[PDB]
Amino acid sequence: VNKYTDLDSELKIMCTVDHQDQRDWIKDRVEQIKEYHHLHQAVHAAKVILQVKESLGLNGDFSVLNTLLNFTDNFDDFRRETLDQINQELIQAKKLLQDISEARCKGLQALSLRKEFICWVREALGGINELKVFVDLASISAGENDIDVDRVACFHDAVQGYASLLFKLDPSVDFSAFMKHLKKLWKALDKDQYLPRKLCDSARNLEWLKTVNESHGSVERSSLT
Numbered sequence: 034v035n036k037y038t039d040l041d042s043e044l045k046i047m048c049t050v051d052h053q054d055q056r057d058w059i060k061d062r063v064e065q066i067k068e069y070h071h072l073h074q075a076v077h078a079a080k081v082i083l084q085v086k087e088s089l090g091l092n093g094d095f096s097v098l099n100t101l102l103n104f105t106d107n108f109d110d111f112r113r114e115t116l117d118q119i120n121q122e123l124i125q126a127k128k129l130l131q132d133i134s135e136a137r138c139k140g141l142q143a144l145s146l147r148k149e150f151i152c153w154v155r156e157a158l159g160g161i162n163e164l165k166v167f168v169d170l171a172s173i174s175a176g177e178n179d180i181d182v183d184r185v186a187c188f189h190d191a192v193q194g195y196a197s198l199l200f201k202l203d204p205s206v207d208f209s210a211f212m213k214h215l216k217k218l219w220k221a222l223d224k225d226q227y228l229p230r231k232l233c234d235s236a237r238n239l240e241w242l243k244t245v246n247e248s249h250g251s252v253e254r255s256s257l258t
Contacts, residue, residue: 084145093207143229150236174249
């Protein structure tokens with residue numbers, strides 16, 4: 034997986050036994066194997082999207098994705114087939130999810146399990162503009178140590194990037210509307226490779242983020258002062 038040039042080399046090594054002269058046919062199998070792997074990746078993406086649905090609280094029906102899960106559950110009887118006899122519905126499901134890579138699946142994962150963080154963020158801010166105010170109070174709380182101060186920047190960047198999903202999303206968002214709210218996060222992850230990990234780090238330190246609002250607001254940590 035993801036080493037298809039190595040696959041081609043290996044298959045030529047298999048050719049060395051001198052069968053099927055000129056051995057070009059393997060190029061076709063290579064693409065077919067790519068499809069199977071990419072097909073399975075779309076399957077994983079589908080589950081993550083379903084988890085995001087329950088995590089964020091969408092309402093738009095996403096029953097069509099079940100098609101891929103329908104393959105994943107009946108993996109045993111379907112596996113009696115070949116590489117080309119798979120079906121065209123799975124091909125079309127690949128067509129839909131073509132623009133998702135494993136990194137985007139990982140961002141979505143970072144979002145899924147963090148329902149509590151989604152809720153606390155939606156209740157506290159509701160508008161990314163308020164984030165700026167919240168960030169100021171967080172700076173008072175940190176403690177002048179690098180990890181503590183950096184928590185603030187990690188949270189700021191996470192919320193600034195994951196904004197469309199967290200704040201403005203409409204519960205009735207359908208498939209394609211979700212894909213566009215996704216394209217914004219897509220461009221953001223393209224600009225920053227660590228944004229999912231920042232989201233996870235922010236969500237793990239939820240208790241401090243909560244503490245910010247009530248207590249940390251004023252006392253003005255006083256180490257260099």
